[PDB]
Amino acid sequence: GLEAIIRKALM
Amino acid sequence: HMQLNPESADLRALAKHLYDSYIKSFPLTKAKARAILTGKTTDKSPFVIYDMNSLMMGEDKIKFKHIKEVAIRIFQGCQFRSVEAVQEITEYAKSIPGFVNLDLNDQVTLLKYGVHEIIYTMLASLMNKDGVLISEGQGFMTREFLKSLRKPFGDFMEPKFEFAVKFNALELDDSDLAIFIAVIILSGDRPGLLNVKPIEDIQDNLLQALELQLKLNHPESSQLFAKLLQKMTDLRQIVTEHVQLLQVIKKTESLHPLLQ
């Protein structure tokens, strides 16, 4: 779920 | 032979840009954490959790942003805080000049493999030999209380304490740490990166900025730069061990509403 939070936080 | 020249001025402007962005994304700074830990602040004195009774009294008095078994409730709080930190660390990464102009998949990869190293770097700011500040400075949980939690939770934070007591003896400040964390984020050796060269280029400029910051800021530690790169190496190890403990727990034992 780490990547999901990162992509979420980047865009 | 060091000179104050346009090149050095640009590296000082980069260091200031990162510091400003660092304390924006993480307002419990080391300066503020150290003031709380040494009792040199006018802010509210943290509630100390040093045993099971003070934890039960603490769940009430300490006001956590999160909402059957003590060890699992503590581990769940720890998990919540790491989810918020991933967002804070991403917001900092976006401030590093060059980072958002990288390939988005490489941005995601640097953050994915970097966030734990950065969490345990920043956690040292909050730690002393007695314990750790929690809930943005409102609580202090002792190191021995955490060690007293049943297996496998008892051994979860102790390696981070061990790292922090040696890391904190370097006496880095927020201006040093802001650049140190940017250096860790711009690691060109992360698995599955598409375009390494532009990452190494940014990292080289950050390494120049870090080296200058440490020379100006640490007159009595001539090889501090080398000692910091040695720590970046040691954080890799800490995180390898941490992901192993996380698997044991996942295979042997509800998450942030941001995931739901």
Swiss-Prot record, chain A:
Motif CORNR box of ID2, residue range(s) on this chain: 2-6
Similarity comment: Belongs to the N-CoR nuclear receptor corepressors family.
Organism: Homo sapiens
Location within or outside the cell: Nucleus
Function: Transcriptional corepressor that mediates the transcriptional repression activity of some nuclear receptors by promoting chromatin condensation, thus preventing access of the basal transcription. Acts by recruiting chromatin modifiers, such as histone deacetylases HDAC1, HDAC2 and HDAC3. Required to activate the histone deacetylase activity of HDAC3. Involved in the regulation BCL6-dependent of the germinal center (GC) reactions, mainly through the control of the GC B-cells proliferation and survival.
Induction section of the entry: Regulated during cell cycle progression.
Domain remarks in the Swiss-Prot or TrEMBL record: The N-terminal region contains repression functions that are divided into three independent repression domains (RD1, RD2 and RD3). The C-terminal region contains the nuclear receptor-interacting domains that are divided in two separate interaction domains (ID1 and ID2). The two interaction domains (ID) contain a conserved sequence referred to as the CORNR box. This motif is required and sufficient to permit binding to unligated TR and RARS. Sequences flanking the CORNR box determine nuclear hormone receptor specificity.
Subunit structure: Forms a large corepressor complex that contains SIN3A/B and histone deacetylases HDAC1 and HDAC2. This complex associates with the thyroid (TR) and the retinoid acid receptors (RAR) in the absence of ligand, and may stabilize their interaction with TFIIB. Interacts directly with RARA in the absence of ligand; the interaction represses RARA activity. Interacts (isoform SMRT) with HDAC10. Interacts with MINT. Component of the N-Cor repressor complex, at least composed of NCOR1, NCOR2, HDAC3, TBL1X, TBL1R, CORO2A and GPS2. Interacts with CBFA2T3 and ATXN1L.
Lineage of producing organism: Eukaryota, Metazoa, Chordata, Craniata, Vertebrata
Record's protein name: Nuclear receptor corepressor 2
Tissue: Ubiquitous. High levels of expression are detected in lung, spleen and brain.
From Swiss-Prot, chain B:
UniProt cross-link Glycyl lysine isopeptide (Lys-Gly) (interchain with G-Cter in ubiquitin), position: 24
Effect caused by changing residue 24 to R: More than 50% loss of ubiquitination
Annotated region described as Interaction with FAM120B, given as residue ranges: 3-52
Binding site for rosiglitazone: 79-82, 116, 242
One cellular component term from this protein's GO annotations in UniProt: RNA polymerase II transcription regulator complex
Biological process according to GO: BMP signaling pathway; cell differentiation; cell fate commitment; cell maturation; cellular response to hypoxia; cellular response to insulin stimulus; cellular response to low-density lipoprotein particle stimulus; epithelial cell differentiation
Every NR LBD domain range: 10-260
GO molecular function term, any single one: DNA binding
Documented activity regulation: PDPK1 activates its transcriptional activity independently of its kinase activity.
Reported tissue expression: Highest expression in adipose tissue. Lower in skeletal muscle, spleen, heart and liver. Also detectable in placenta, lung and ovary.
Induction trigger: (Microbial infection) Expression increases when incubated with M.tuberculosis or its lipoprotein LpqH; induction is TLR2-dependent (at protein level).
Compartments in which it is found: Nucleus; Cytoplasm
Record keywords, A-Z: Activator, Biological rhythms, Cytoplasm, Diabetes mellitus, Disease variant, DNA-binding, Glycoprotein, Isopeptide bond, Metal-binding, Nucleus, Obesity, Phosphoprotein, Receptor, Transcription, Transcription regulation, Ubl conjugation, Zinc, Zinc-finger
Recorded domain comment: The 9aaTAD motif is a transactivation domain present in a large number of yeast and animal transcription factors.
Quaternary structure (record): Interacts with FOXO1 (acetylated form). Heterodimer with other nuclear receptors, such as RXRA. The heterodimer with the retinoic acid receptor RXRA is called adipocyte-specific transcription factor ARF6. Interacts with NCOA6 coactivator, leading to a strong increase in transcription of target genes. Interacts with coactivator PPARBP, leading to a mild increase in transcription of target genes. Interacts with NOCA7 in a ligand-inducible manner. Interacts with NCOA1 and NCOA2 LXXLL motifs. Interacts with ASXL1, ASXL2, DNTTIP2, FAM120B, MAP2K1/MEK1, NR0B2, PDPK1, PRDM16, PRMT2 and TGFB1I1.
Record's function text: Nuclear receptor that binds peroxisome proliferators such as hypolipidemic drugs and fatty acids. Once activated by a ligand, the nuclear receptor binds to DNA specific PPAR response elements (PPRE) and modulates the transcription of its target genes, such as acyl-CoA oxidase. It therefore controls the peroxisomal beta-oxidation pathway of fatty acids. Key regulator of adipocyte differentiation and glucose homeostasis. ARF6 acts as a key regulator of the tissue-specific adipocyte P2 (aP2) enhancer. (Microbial infection) Upon treatment with M.tuberculosis or its lipoprotein LpqH, phosphorylation of MAPK p38 and IL-6 production are modulated, probably via this protein.
Name of the protein this chain belongs to: Peroxisome proliferator-activated receptor gamma
Organism: Homo sapiens
